[PDB]
Amino acid sequence: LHKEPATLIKAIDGETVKLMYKGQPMTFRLLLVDTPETKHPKKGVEKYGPEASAFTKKMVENAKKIEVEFDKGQRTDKYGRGLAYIYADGKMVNEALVRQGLAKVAYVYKPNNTHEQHLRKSEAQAKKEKLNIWS
């Protein structure tokens, strides 16, 4: 796997950010994570939804360097969103959320699962600390 620069355009929610990637604006969906939703008629605004969104927002907007890291499989989902691990100043946003109890490790579709163990570890830790979603 290898990281590549990208430039923030706009944070959308806990698990979705719009980035300028190789001169093209594109929506990125964070691999292996599921944050409570904010925007949707179906299951409305879930608890921690606002919290997950603010955390991703703050994390990426405060970064001086954003990097994108694709996995080994498909790089886009059916909605045309890039599927990646996003790094803000070297910190993986996907793991940060999980670690904080603001996302569940989800949507594990092989072979796009290189960091699954890593994330599972952090999830178990947030669970053990009864953080947010796990409180």
Ligand X SMILES: Cc1cn([C@H]2C[C@H](OP(=O)(O)O)[C@@H](COP(=O)(O)O)O2)c(=O)[nH]c1=O
**Residues identified as active-site:** 29, 37, 81
Out of ligand X, Ca ion, none, what residue 42 binds, judged by CB under 5 to 8 A for its kind, is none
Comparison of 15 and 67: residue with beta carbon closer to ligand X: 15
- Residue 109 makes contact with ligand X by CB under 6 A: yes
Answer whether 50's CB lies under 8 Å from 38's CB: yes
DSSP 8-state class, residue 132: G
How distant, in Å, are the alpha carbons of 8, 11, 101 from that of 18? 7, 6, 23
- Residue 95 makes contact with ligand X by CB under 6 A: no
- Residue 17 makes contact with ligand X by CB under 6 A: no
Q: Is 13 helix (H, G, I), strand (E, B) or coil?
A: strand
| Strand (E) or helix (H) holding 7 | strand 3-13
- Residue 71 makes contact with ligand X by CB under 6 A: no
Q: Which chain residues interact with ligand X by CB under 6 A? A: 15-16, 29, 31, 34, 77-78, 83, 107, 109, 112
